[PDB]
Amino acid sequence: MKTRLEQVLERYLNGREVAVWGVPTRRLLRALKPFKFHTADRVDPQYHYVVAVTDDDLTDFLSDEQSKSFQYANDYLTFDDEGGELPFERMCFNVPVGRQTYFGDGVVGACENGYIKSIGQFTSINGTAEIHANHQLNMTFVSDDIQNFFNEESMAVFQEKLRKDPKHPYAYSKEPMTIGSDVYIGAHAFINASTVTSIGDGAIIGSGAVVLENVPPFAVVVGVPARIKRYRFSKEMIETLLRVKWWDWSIEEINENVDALISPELFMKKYG
Amino acid sequence: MKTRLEQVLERYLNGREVAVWGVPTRRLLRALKPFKFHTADRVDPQYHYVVAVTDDDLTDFLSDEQSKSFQYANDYLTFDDEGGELPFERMCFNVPVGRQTYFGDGVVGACENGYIKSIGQFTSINGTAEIHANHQLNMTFVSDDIQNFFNEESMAVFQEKLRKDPKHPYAYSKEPMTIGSDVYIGAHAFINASTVTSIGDGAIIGSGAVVLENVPPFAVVVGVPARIKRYRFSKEMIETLLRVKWWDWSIEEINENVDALISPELFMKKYG
Amino acid sequence: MKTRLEQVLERYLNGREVAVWGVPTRRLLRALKPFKFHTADRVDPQYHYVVAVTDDDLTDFLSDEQSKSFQYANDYLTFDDEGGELPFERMCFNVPVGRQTYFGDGVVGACENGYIKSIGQFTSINGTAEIHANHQLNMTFVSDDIQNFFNEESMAVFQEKLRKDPKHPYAYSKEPMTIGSDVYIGAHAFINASTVTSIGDGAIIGSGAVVLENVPPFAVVVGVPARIKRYRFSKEMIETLLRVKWWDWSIEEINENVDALISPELFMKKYGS
């Protein structure tokens, strides 16, 4: 598919040459082949778009006096940062991701696995959070890679049972999960992709939480298994929030309405 | 002793040359010295065995149309994948590992530490699972690296007390862990190498579980600390399973009795 | 700002050349600018100090027969190991770290974020442990990166409310946390940098524990969220330990009192007063 980098370069490269900051990998070279590129030496934002290969390389680049006139995404990006936030809506494999939303390699993998339908705007997911499905639980075995030994006939009856399974092994037979906007997920959290179809808008998933069922909008869930500890707002305000959907506002609307975003009391007065 | 790649090349290289896909590392070049190798350009499975250096390199390889004649393990492997599954029983730091069994870097480390006696067949361990022992808890200090300041005399006094400690700090004076066959371990799980000697065949360890005691065969454990939630099968069927040991079956046997593998009621009718 | 490597070379390089064991990186070559360095081939501790670039590189070096003449820290180090243990007290992003103390990249990042005041001596932190703060919980939004869209007037109003927030979003307006000496933190543990200011001396944080408030000295905490399960020692010996502070002892004193360190009963007979 189109990587994050490719989506950014299609939007912001603007005919410049890519200055690679770090050791180029084969995956990077494949992504840059539609573009002119070279190993960064002296860089000028009028002439160059800087791609740091790793986050390590970005730290070095941003520590260098040459980076001062380079703006995030517009002039530079990290290649190995497929979950990194962007100022525009993007695709992660074939999952739409909203603005200013970030996540780590586990969620990137879940996006590739087809476990995720969409990730909302202004959503914050700690890099250590994980999303995996259940194996089959209604067979004699729980192994998945046993199937590498299955011939065509055995694999057919095995696959056929996997669909009829109402418990959705490997996320079969279910809708991929929606992760809403203005969502927060802390370190080492886990969401089960066989048994969860929605993390509601505004949900907060605490560190260490193991989420086995849907999280309602603006619920705060903690623990193993994860349980609703409280809601962020009253029922009336949650009702208003889901109607107004400030997370779809334009940048101008976000700034014009900043007092209502900073103050829930002013939000309710204006919209509720 | 031998890395995973070396065990695979010993079995499958078949007089071909190794085509390296990705930037090589010091440890890869050490593993490749007995074999002729070169940087991959054009590759053909009749002539070449493709070694992807990193998991990212493999992703790039399998996206290239040159790869679709290449079979997993038989014609290509990832070097940085010591926990990766294989169609034959292998060694991981002198720990026997069964067919189609995979685990991540934490479990690889525990094998190197001598914490694990063996890992069974068709066993599936999430890459973020961890296995560590306890430090000593019957001394004034809990630190391990204070011993870096111990002269000869102090080290001898410290080691003699560790060796008679019935709680097996650093897994001293206990049997290394057996992990059974048809076992599942989910994300962020932990197993204490000081207090656990067996994960029974068929055991399922839920994501986030913190396992401090042996897990009986076919038990499902969850939580912090881990406690049994349920058993996969009746006591009679568990007895039957531990007798038949389908996980030692030939590939022919697996396909012939695939009906019994997918239907536990057929399994008990045929073998119970 | 000085890397761990530079701090070690400043003390131990002793006029030698750095032999780089592994593929060098941008960050390594910048840290090696003040030094003589070359790609390692044949290495001799008389002439060379070996820097493994990655931990995997270090595994390869230590499997090589040339490495048996090299002592840890004195003659070799890993570049990608900013939280690695050392025989001297060091800085990690302006955070003092005691001797023989180790931690992983999660704690290193917490150091860089300003969340940690100091980390004590002989403290063992699993590499998978994580320390981060809460976002603001008193606004309409919980996102942080929404602020990339704030103009200067919006950002000012946002930052003003964060600074007056008594629950310390992003660790605002609180003391960075102290992590004591002789501390142990297990795999996948988490400490909340918004609501924790002290992990007491001698505390044990079990694997998977989610620590949301201060851990008293020598308490053992487990669970999500973490709860005190037991103390390592009696009240009297905890008082004695906090006074003797053997973790500040010199190498000479540590070996002279090895018996008191190994047997708590002997520790109290000598120090319990």
Ligand SMILES: CN[C@@H]1[C@@H](O[C@H]2O[C@H](CO)[C@@H](N)[C@H](O)[C@H]2O)O[C@H]2C[C@@H](N)[C@@H](O[C@H]3[C@H](O)[C@@H](O)[C@H](N)C[C@@H]3N)O[C@@H]2[C@@H]1O
């Ligand atoms: C550079 N500082 C940032 C900090 O900013 C906060 O403290 C700053 C200094 O006091 C303030 N100037 C700022 O207003 C305030 O918001 O907010 C945290 C929030 C946390 N979820 C995470 O998200 C990042 C992810 O970790 C990362 O992976 C992703 N790429 C980007 C995310 N923002 O890391 C950032 C980062 O540590």
Ligand SMILES: CN[C@@H]1[C@@H](O[C@H]2O[C@H](CO)[C@@H](N)[C@H](O)[C@H]2O)O[C@H]2C[C@@H](N)[C@@H](O[C@H]3[C@H](O)[C@@H](O)[C@H](N)C[C@@H]3N)O[C@@H]2[C@@H]1O
């Ligand atoms: C590539 N797809 C796989 C999926 O297969 C399932 O969904 C497919 C598409 O719907 C089906 N065709 C297939 O029959 C079914 O089993 O099962 C999961 C099971 C999970 N424990 C893990 O194990 C992998 C580890 O994560 C990895 O590290 C290790 N190398 C190999 C393991 N299989 O990742 C795989 C992987 O996401």
Ligand SMILES: CN[C@@H]1[C@@H](O[C@H]2O[C@H](CO)[C@@H](N)[C@H](O)[C@H]2O)O[C@H]2C[C@@H](N)[C@@H](O[C@H]3[C@H](O)[C@@H](O)[C@H](N)C[C@@H]3N)O[C@@H]2[C@@H]1O
């Ligand atoms: C190389 N072996 C070491 C082992 O030594 C123990 O078993 C040995 C016998 O097999 C004994 N000779 C030794 O006396 C005893 O203490 O103690 C553990 C303690 C654990 N917190 C971790 O800490 C390490 C961190 O994982 C690492 O990241 C950090 N750099 C250094 C830490 N010690 O990994 C080490 C490592 O596995």
